[PDB]
Design a binder for this molecule. Structure first.
Ligand code: MG
Ligand code: MG
Ligand code: MG
Ligand code: MG
Ligand code: MG
Ligand code: MG
Ligand code: MG
Ligand code: MG
Ligand code: MG
Ligand code: MG
Ligand code: MG
Ligand code: MG
Ligand code: MG
Ligand code: MG
Ligand code: MG
Ligand code: MG
Ligand code: MG
Ligand code: MG
Ligand code: MG
Ligand code: MG
Ligand code: MG
Ligand code: MG
Ligand code: MG
Ligand code: MG
Ligand code: MG
Ligand code: MG
Ligand code: MG
Ligand code: MG
Lengths: 61, 65, 132, 190
RNA sequence: ACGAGACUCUGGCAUGCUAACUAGUUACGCGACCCCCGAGCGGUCGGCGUCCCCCAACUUCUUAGAGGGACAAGUGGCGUUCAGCCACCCGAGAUUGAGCAAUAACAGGUCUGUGAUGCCCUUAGAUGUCCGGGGCUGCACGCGCGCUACACUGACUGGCUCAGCGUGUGCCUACCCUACGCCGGCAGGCGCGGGUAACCCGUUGAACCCCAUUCGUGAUGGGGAUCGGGGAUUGCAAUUAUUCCCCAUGAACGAGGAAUUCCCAGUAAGUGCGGGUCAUAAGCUUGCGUUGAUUAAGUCCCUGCCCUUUGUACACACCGCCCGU
């Protein structure tokens, strides 16, 4: 299923050239839930991300 | 400040085996008058004056003259 | 970046040292005082010096600064430093001592003190950090 | 007073069905303008182009290629004609069609490359809403541009067809094909 | 202490100051035209007075002088609560763009810029210096900087409507910028005036752009190479076509392999206009405007350059040193 998540805190810049951004995201359906995600493109705190597959987690720096 | 604080001169002298070149640079001193130096100071030189002595007031005194 | 070069900082510190009374927290009054007292051949340099003087004055009002010290501030710190309690903190009606301390006092013919109270020493001798 | 794009397209009835993209599409009351031409300074600061109305963003992105750089009045005319054609074909507000097309065209999961000049390996990542809007507009403009080239068909008609197909969700559009391929590659790079 | 910053020029703000017939505005008179259904304290006027005997005021717009103005100053966060960073209010502006630029070096370029210059060589059958004619451009082929295109977001034919930076009659020195009238279809030719210049060209009627017309995916009315025949200007001289104009001819080219360049806001790109060269003269360069974006507010992956640690049998410094046939 497709899920929506809210960006709580921006963590850092990842990638070979720094193209990706590592952030912390909390699910809308369950406010207790929180994971770490890699986002492509400009992103700031409060943005809403559409997770097609919400089980994957990213290796934080 | 190089334009008005530095005086430059380039000369050539012919010696037996060829030409020698001479370069001379002189940095002028600051002079309030324009006789032997630039009138204006260097841009980054700040001169803060020493405060004068002030008598500490003790009792209100009214002087009429 | 907005880092101030050492020229601005040195001029501001000297101005605050010499004319602390005339300055305040207003940038415009400070910049009017600076041109009165100091010789700055530039308008932008004067504005930078005044803007640092205002920040430094606010910092001084918050508390002491690591750098300059004002004569009035030093004199007031002397008054704050002559603070004296009504009673001495050394005065105690009962002072607890170990038996070895009492023996040391006795060897100096001071075993007749009434303020002394002998406390039981710790039973176990374990005062070292566990090596590992 | 009521402000309508080109004097005839109202903005009150338009509504956005995506919660994520609500903060990055500017079509609503305070972003309602008469024309998609404001000479604004939106590129001065980061994230400031999210306040630019979406019609003006389409107009800006339609000034390609280099033979059409700076010709923004022709682009405004093209957008006006395309909206007229869309209203005639579908019968609904062209602004709603544009919003639906931009929502449907934006990829949701992408793949980031780790490439030694010849061989490339990739890993799946997420796409921020602003990049989704940017890529949707770029894909729509590219599809219209490639459709109009070397063909007896006005650029306005091709743009209208591209927008209608993208809003409908049909695979006949360039943007939907590109989005599907990008998402398939991202899925396979998990 | 030098470099960096500071500094100088430049671009943005001032209805506050100074003051202007080689800049204007407004107002008032005269005049031309339109509406006699509203004729008016009416509209348009880059049409004429209002300084010079007397017949208006004033710098908003134009010029350029003196000063002001912005300092991370105010607020909220994050920071050792420091140095400083992020966001926001107010504000013309919260990072305009250039110039100058240290200690030390390179066998970097320049003797073809110099009456800068040391040594060689030549000097009357000249390597001096003039004159005449050629060459520097010669074409089986490779390599760079560029211009024009491959069209319909186009081409063609009309109509409408907007700039800025600058130059202009020259010691020798011959060669300036051009308004207006007539002739020619055009390149041009005749007259007759202004300007040594905020005075004249000039209100620099620029091009893209805008509004209509024709064409209709056809190497086509896209593209304009290569050629034929005529006409005219500069020159003492145009052939190996100086340049320009007119008919005719109508090539490759349908977006470009490996590889590779430049760029973060009035920027990239599109589009014209000045200056240099210039008797004749821009596909180059150096500047100026006009239309005007996509993307990014990061990193050390590629490339390169700096630091710290570390190893060295290198010091002409890895293009090194060095071993054995
Ligand atoms: Mg077409
Ligand atoms: Mg004025
Ligand atoms: Mg050499
Ligand atoms: Mg030389
Ligand atoms: Mg020589
Ligand atoms: Mg020589
Ligand atoms: Mg030469
Ligand atoms: Mg001869
Ligand atoms: Mg000859
Ligand atoms: Mg040659
Ligand atoms: Mg070159
Ligand atoms: Mg080229
Ligand atoms: Mg060029
Ligand atoms: Mg056109
Ligand atoms: Mg043609
Ligand atoms: Mg025609
Ligand atoms: Mg035309
Ligand atoms: Mg043809
Ligand atoms: Mg043809
Ligand atoms: Mg001929
Ligand atoms: Mg020849
Ligand atoms: Mg022809
Ligand atoms: Mg040019
Ligand atoms: Mg020329
Ligand atoms: Mg050349
Ligand atoms: Mg690197
Ligand atoms: Mg070793
Ligand atoms: Mg060593």
């Amino acid at each position: 299923p497709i899920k929506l998540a809210r960006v709580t805190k921006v963590l850092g810049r990842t990638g070979s050239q720094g193209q990706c951004t590592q952030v912390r995201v909390e699910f809308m359906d369950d406010t207790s839930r929180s994971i770490i995600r890699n986002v492509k493109g400009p992103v700031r705190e409060g943005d809403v991300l559409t997770l097609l597959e919400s089980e994957r987690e990213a290796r934080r720096l | 400040p190089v334009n008005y604080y530095v005086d430059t001169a380039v000369r050539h002298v012919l010696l037996r085996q060829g030409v020698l070149g001479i370069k001379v640079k002189i940095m002028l001193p600051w002079d309030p008058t324009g006789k032997i130096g630039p009138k204006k100071p260097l841009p980054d030189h700040v001169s803060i004056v020493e405060p004068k002595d002030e008598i500490l007031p003790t009792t209100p005194i009214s002087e009429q003259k | 970046g907005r880092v101030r070069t050492k020229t601005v900082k040195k001029a501001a510190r000297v101005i605050i040292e010499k004319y602390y009374t005339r300055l305040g927290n207003d940038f415009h009054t400070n910049k009017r005082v600076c041109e009165e007292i100091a010789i700055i051949p530039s308008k932008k340099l004067r504005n930078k010096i005044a803007g640092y003087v205002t920040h430094l004055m606010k910092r001084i009002q918050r508390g002491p600064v690591r750098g300059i010290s004002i004569k009035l501030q030093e004199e007031e710190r002397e008054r704050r430093d002559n603070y004296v309690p009504e009673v001495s903190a050394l005065d105690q009606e009962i002072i607890e001592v170990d038996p070895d301390t009492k023996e040391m006092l006795k060897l100096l013919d001071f075993g007749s003190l009434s303020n002394l109270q002998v406390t039981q020493p710790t039973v176990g001798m374990n005062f070292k950090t566990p090596r590992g | 007073p009521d402000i309508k794009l080109f004097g005839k397209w109202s903005t009150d009835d338009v509504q956005i069905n995506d919660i994520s993209l609500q903060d990055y599409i500017a079509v609503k009351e305070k972003y309602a303008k008469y024309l998609p031409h404001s000479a604004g300074r939106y590129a001065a600061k980061r994230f400031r182009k999210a306040q630019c109305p979406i019609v003006e963003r389409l107009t800006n992105s339609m000034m390609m290629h280099g033979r059409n750089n700076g010709k923004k009045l022709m682009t405004v005319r093209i957008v006006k004609h395309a909206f007229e054609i869309i209203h005639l074909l579908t019968g609904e507000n062209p602004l709603q069609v544009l919003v639906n097309a931009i929502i449907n065209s934006g990829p949701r999961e992408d793949s980031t490359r780790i490439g030694r000049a010849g061989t490339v390996r990739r890993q799946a990542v997420d796409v921020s809403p602003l990049r989704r809007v940017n890529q949707a507009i770029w894909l729509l403009c590219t599809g219209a541009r490639e459709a109009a080239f070397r063909n007896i068909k006005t650029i306005a008609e091709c743009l209208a067809d591209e927008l209608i197909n993208a809003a409908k969700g049909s695979s006949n559009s360039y943007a939907i094909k590109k989005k599907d391929e990008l998402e398939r590659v991202a899925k396979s790079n998990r």
